[PDB]
Structures are given as structure tokens and as C-alpha cells.
Design a protein around this ligand. Sequence first.
Ligand code: GDS
Ligand code: GDS
Lengths: 204, 204
Amino acid sequence: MIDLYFAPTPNGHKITLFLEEAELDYRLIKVDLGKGGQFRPEFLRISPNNKIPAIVDHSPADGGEPLSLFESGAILLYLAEKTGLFLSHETRERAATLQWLFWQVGGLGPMLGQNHHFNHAAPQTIPYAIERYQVETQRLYHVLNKRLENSPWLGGENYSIADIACWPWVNAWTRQRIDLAMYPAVKNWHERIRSRPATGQALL
Amino acid sequence: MIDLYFAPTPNGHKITLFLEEAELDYRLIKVDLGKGGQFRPEFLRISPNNKIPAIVDHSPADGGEPLSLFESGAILLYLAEKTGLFLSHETRERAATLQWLFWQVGGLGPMLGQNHHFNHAAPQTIPYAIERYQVETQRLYHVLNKRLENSPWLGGENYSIADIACWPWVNAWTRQRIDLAMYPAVKNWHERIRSRPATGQALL
Ligand SMILES: N[C@@H](CCC(=O)N[C@@H](CSSC[C@H](NC(=O)CC[C@H](N)C(=O)O)C(=O)NCC(=O)O)C(=O)NCC(=O)O)C(=O)O
Ligand SMILES: N[C@@H](CCC(=O)N[C@@H](CSSC[C@H](NC(=O)CC[C@H](N)C(=O)O)C(=O)NCC(=O)O)C(=O)NCC(=O)O)C(=O)O
């Protein structure tokens, strides 16, 4: 049993995707981010960076006490290692997978997040910053599409944690002033993953 | 032999640190970022996201053709896996290490980078954005210090790729309008890693 500390967000949805895909037992423990749930001391012990997602794995493979982890990327990696699923053990495909996973974590998510912030959250309008993060979103979707033109999935021939990590951010394209049709390979990969049974399950 | 595609930056320095620490043969292939080196087509084949660092590993453990990787985090992980060094194989320490590695890649580096951008690069002064990234830098150094108060290294008792990934960003504190003395645990960890022989070697 995995407890997932969760708010309905792209980053939270990365973990429900994986959990449904891997067929792992879990429950959702809602964290209320508008009401400062993420600063509750006993959450900060689970997740010191004050963010969701975080998990508590009640059955760690060493059979010890529960294990807490934060950071969507490290949760996906830890769960891919634990299950043997959605991350290859072959050196080249594994490396390519990890590369795009770190790419999503360092680039896609931080930059689209700044985009969501300046366009849908900031008190006052900051044209330099809106332009700066809009151009970067486009570059990021161009990088994403470039790869998906050459490979069916980001790591090679198999669906992996790299695709799982990006999908919920692409799925918020409507909030990013992105026309998904400008990136046909992204558009197809997006619909392909939308129609996977586990994604369906996570979206209920 | 590892070729490292490199510019003198925090992100580039993560890889020289590791390489010196692991005692791996490598050469530096300078990429000129002010002159658009990162858009040269044969670099973009190595590193499609148009960034350094990237490596070409000429002796991959499978004995195949050279293997290219981009993203500092995936390079460190790939090299830690390949060498068996600076990332634990014990489940809990490994997970804690990876957590802080992803934390650096998703938070520390993107946010300090935005900080360096608005304070030392942007054409015009954007007070909302300068304030936004300055507060976030402080929060990030507070998270970093909080951890280093409770553990000697970010992953547990051993120096690891989590520390290697953060160190060059902390080492640019003078560019961030950060008083390192406000974060004593960070200050000590910083000097401790400055004085390691391999860091010394990488700084020549
Ligand atoms: N690197 C972490 C990021 C986790 C994260 O961003 N969590 C958010 C909710 S996801 S929803 C997306 C999230 N935005 C936000 O959290 C909005 C509030 C924020 N402080 C702001 O002003 O931008 C974002 O932009 N993320 C960028 C990224 O994924 O790298 C959170 O718990 N926030 C609590 C808080 O901020 O107090 C991961 O992958 O787990
Ligand atoms: N996530 C990647 C980031 C790699 C990266 O940022 N590389 C930089 C040089 S490191 S030096 C630090 C880097 N800044 C820059 O590259 C400055 C130029 C930039 N386009 C801007 O306007 O901010 C930065 O802020 N990084 C944030 C982070 O680490 O997440 C690069 O090659 N830039 C070429 C280009 O931009 O065309 C990784 O970990 O490898």
C-alpha cells in the first residue's frame, strides 16, 4: 500500500498514472494547497520542500518502517525500480528514458509552471515575463515533438516513466496558450496516452 | 573515455566534479554558447534540447557504438550506475539521494537560473520577477539548510550525486544575492566539498 499525498495538478497526476499503470495498491491523501496543507509539520516531515506529490510506501522491499519520498521524478523512478515496470533495464533505452525524465523535471514542468503563473496567477501583467515563458514553452514543445517524430515513445519503443512524467503537463496545454496541432507528434502521443485504460482509470 | 560537451557554468561543473571524483578518463569539448554552438546540428544530435552538458561515452558497458546523453541529472545518474559510485544501492539511502537530485534539477537549478537571469541578463528591470525569484531562492536555501542540519550529506551518511548536483549552484551564491552565512549548514557543506581533492582538480 502506497499513500499518495495529492492535489489535482499535473505533478500529482504523474503519480496516479503510474500507480494505475503498475497496478499498485494505493490511497489518496488530499493535501489542501490553497489552505496551506503543505506547511503542516507532519507533511513537512514527509515532504520537506513543502510540495506534493509525496508518497509513503507502507511496504518497502526491505520490509522496514514505511518509506517517505517526495519529488514526482524520484517517486516515478523509485516506483519503476521497485516494480520493474516503465523503466528499461537495458542500458541505452534506460539512459534515454532517464534523460527525458530529467528533461521534463528540469525544463518542461518548471517552464510551463512559470507560464501558468504569469498568465493565470500573477497579481499584475508582466509582458517581458509572459513573452519569455511563452517562447520557452514553444521551444519545449518543439523539442518534445522533434523526439516523438523519431521514436513512438520518449525512451525508445516502450511506454515509460518519461512519457508518464510529461503527459499531465501536455494535458494542460489548453492553459498554456499552445495549439497542440502545431505539434502533430505530440498531439498523437497525447491522444494515444489519453486512451490507455490506466489513464482512463486515473481520470476517474 | 567520456567526451564532455561543456561550458563553464554550474551545470557543466556538475559533470567535471563527478568525473574527477569517479576517476574516469574524459576530455572537454568546449561548446560556445554566446556564439550558438548549442545549435550546431551535430551537437543537436548529441543534445536535442540545445543545452550543455552532454556526454558521449565511447566505451558503453554493452560494448556497442558510443552513447550520447544530455541532462546533467541523467548524466550523473548514468555515471553513478555505470561506476557504482556516488549513488547507494541500498534502497532508503538510494531513494533519499534521488529525491534531492530531482529536487536540485526541478527546483534549485531552474529557480536560481531565473534569479541569475532577472538580475544579470534581462534587458529591462522587472521588480515583480526579481522579487518572485529572490524569495524562492531563499526558500530553496532554507530547504537545503534544513536537510544539512539533520544529515551530513543530502542522501544520508555518504557524499553522492545529490551533493555533486547542488554544489556548483551553491558555489555561485555570490551571483544570487545570497548571504551564505544565513545558512550555516549549507556554508559548512559548501566548504567541505570545496576542499575535497577532486573538486580542487575540477577547478583547475
Ligand atoms: N519538482 C516538484 C514540483 C512539485 C510541485 O510543483 N508541486 C506543487 C503543486 S503541482 S501544480 C504546478 C506547480 N505550481 C504551483 O504549485 C503553483 C504555486 C507556486 N508556488 C507558484 O507560485 O508557481 C508548478 O509550477 N510546478 C513546477 C514544476 O513542476 O517544476 C505544490 O505542491 N505547490 C505547493 C506550493 O507551491 O506551496 C515535483 O516534480 O514534484
Ligand atoms: N536541465 C538542464 C539544464 C542545462 C542548462 O541550463 N544548460 C545551459 C548552460 S548552464 S548555465 C545556467 C542556465 N542558464 C542559461 O543557460 C542562460 C541562458 C538561458 N537561455 C536563459 O535565458 O536563462 C540555467 O539557468 N539553467 C537552469 C537549470 O539548470 O535548470 C545551456 O546550455 N544553455 C544554452 C541555451 O540556453 O541556449 C541540465 O541539468 O542539464
